[PDB]
Design an enzyme around this catalytic site. Structure first.
Site, PDB file in Angstrom:
ATOM      1  N   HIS A 112      74.210  10.505 -28.833  1.00  0.00           N
ATOM      2  CA  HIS A 112      75.003   9.941 -29.900  1.00  0.00           C
ATOM      3  C   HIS A 112      75.027   8.419 -29.993  1.00  0.00           C
ATOM      4  O   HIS A 112      74.823   7.731 -29.053  1.00  0.00           O
ATOM      5  CB  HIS A 112      76.413  10.548 -29.903  1.00  0.00           C
ATOM      6  CG  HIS A 112      77.383   9.910 -28.959  1.00  0.00           C
ATOM      7  ND1 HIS A 112      78.042   8.748 -29.235  1.00  0.00           N
ATOM      8  CD2 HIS A 112      77.816  10.286 -27.749  1.00  0.00           C
ATOM      9  CE1 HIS A 112      78.825   8.425 -28.246  1.00  0.00           C
ATOM     10  NE2 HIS A 112      78.711   9.347 -27.331  1.00  0.00           N
ATOM     11  N   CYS A 113      75.276   7.930 -31.194  1.00  0.00           N
ATOM     12  CA  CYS A 113      75.559   6.528 -31.522  1.00  0.00           C
ATOM     13  C   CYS A 113      76.858   6.548 -32.347  1.00  0.00           C
ATOM     14  O   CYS A 113      77.719   7.281 -32.008  1.00  0.00           O
ATOM     15  CB  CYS A 113      74.333   5.790 -32.149  1.00  0.00           C
ATOM     16  SG  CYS A 113      73.633   6.003 -33.866  1.00  0.00           S
ATOM     17  N   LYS A 114      77.004   5.771 -33.408  1.00  0.00           N
ATOM     18  CA  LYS A 114      78.140   5.882 -34.309  1.00  0.00           C
ATOM     19  C   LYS A 114      77.909   6.967 -35.398  1.00  0.00           C
ATOM     20  O   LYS A 114      78.714   7.929 -35.560  1.00  0.00           O
ATOM     21  CB  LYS A 114      78.410   4.536 -34.961  1.00  0.00           C
ATOM     22  CG  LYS A 114      79.888   4.161 -34.965  1.00  0.00           C
ATOM     23  CD  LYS A 114      80.463   4.011 -33.534  1.00  0.00           C
ATOM     24  CE  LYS A 114      81.514   2.857 -33.427  1.00  0.00           C
ATOM     25  NZ  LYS A 114      82.843   3.303 -32.935  1.00  0.00           N
ATOM     26  N   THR A 124      70.430   7.004 -32.485  1.00  0.00           N
ATOM     27  CA  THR A 124      70.218   8.386 -32.098  1.00  0.00           C
ATOM     28  C   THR A 124      68.814   8.891 -32.407  1.00  0.00           C
ATOM     29  O   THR A 124      68.206   9.544 -31.586  1.00  0.00           O
ATOM     30  CB  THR A 124      71.276   9.274 -32.751  1.00  0.00           C
ATOM     31  OG1 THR A 124      72.581   8.821 -32.346  1.00  0.00           O
ATOM     32  CG2 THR A 124      71.075  10.689 -32.329  1.00  0.00           C
TER      33      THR A 124
END
Ligand code: NA
Length: 305
Positions: free
Chosen positions: A99-101, A107
């Site tokens: 995950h990222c934001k 990602t």
């Protein structure tokens, strides 16, 4: 499914892409993994900006510090591949969640690289496109920026040409920049532009074209282009980020708080220069900017060393 409502995708059966676990609330992301994959998951947090209580995932979170709209270091990318590889091959039921934001650009960069490593695809383009389908056939559904595409390609090159190991170190000095299709970009002659070279998170060179601050600007109206001699450049090694700024009001900023920018790795450069086309520069790669950056817009860095 099963009481869960999560921005979460099975890219494959054992690879998951998702959004940030906030306080997707973190407790239910926590439940999900404890329920669907008990003792068999590893979470990868790709945000340099944000963390959380990793105990909610039984301390099985591995961090890659990546800036929003940027790329990991090659070293970091390669380490992630090693960590994921060990985890994935240890137990056929092991699962990785990345995950990222937005579960988008950062990602997609690691997921498509992981997909390359895992042999599901031969080329970065195919992986990126595949991740794009699962997440939402276009390479720009997969990741967000041209540098993110480049870094997947870098991983493809490493895996194919360097036996999955880092290439031999090259070091460079930037001696020149050429920008083509300059008209309609800022003041249209480069006078409003400056270039910042960033290595390891620090400014390493700043050039201001009009003033000849570490540079000498030449404007060619016949060829519609600018050439700029770059002076005082330190020796550059590794992942270099080049950012272009404008003092001009008509040149808007995209990501990274600048008109346009890009990343490259010194050892993965070939010869004497790197030239990027429009769709390979971060920000101009977006269709919305195409009446500013025309289709022969181009940036070239000249090296020695
Ligand atoms: Na050396």
């Amino acid at each position: 499914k099963d009481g869960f409502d999560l921005d979460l995708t099975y890219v494959t059966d054992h690879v998951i892409a998702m959004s940030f676990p906030s306080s997707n609330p973190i407790g239910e992301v926590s439940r999900f993994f404890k329920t669907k994959h008990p003792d068999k998951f590893r979470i990868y947090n790709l945000c340099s900006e944000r963390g959380y209580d990793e105990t909610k995932f039984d301390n099985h979170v591995y961090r890659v510090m990546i800036d929003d709209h940027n790329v990991p270091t090659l070293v970091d990318l390669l380490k992630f591949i090693d960590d994921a590889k060990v985890w994935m091959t240890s137990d056929p039921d092991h699962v990785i969640a990345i995950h990222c934001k937005g579960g988008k650009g950062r990602t997609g960069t690691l997921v498509s690289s992981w997909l390359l490593e895992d042999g599901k695809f031969d080329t970065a383009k195919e992986a990126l496109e595949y991740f794009g389908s699962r997440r939402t056939g276009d390479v720009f559904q997969g990741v967000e920026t041209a540098s993110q595409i480049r870094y997947v390609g870098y991983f493809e090159k490493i895996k194919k040409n360097y036996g999955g190991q880092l290439p031999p170190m090259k070091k460079l000095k930037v001696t020149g920049v050429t920008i083509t299709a300059i008209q309609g970009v800022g003041r249209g002659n480069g006078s409003d532009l400056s270039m910042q070279i960033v290595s390891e998170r620090q400014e390493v060179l700043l050039c201001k074209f009009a003033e000849g601050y570490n540079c000498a600007l030449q404007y060619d109206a016949t060829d519609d282009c600018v050439t700029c001699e770059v002076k005082n450049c330190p020796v550059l090694a590794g992942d270099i980020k080049v950012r272009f700024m404008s003092t001009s009001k008509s040149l808007p900023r995209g990501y990274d708080n600048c008109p346009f920018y890009f990343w490259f790795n010194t050892s993965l450069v070939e010869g004497d220069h790197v030239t990027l086309k429009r769709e390979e520069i971060d920000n101009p790669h977006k269709k919305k900017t195409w009446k500013i950056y025309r289709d022969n817009f181009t940036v070239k860095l000249t090296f020695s060393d």
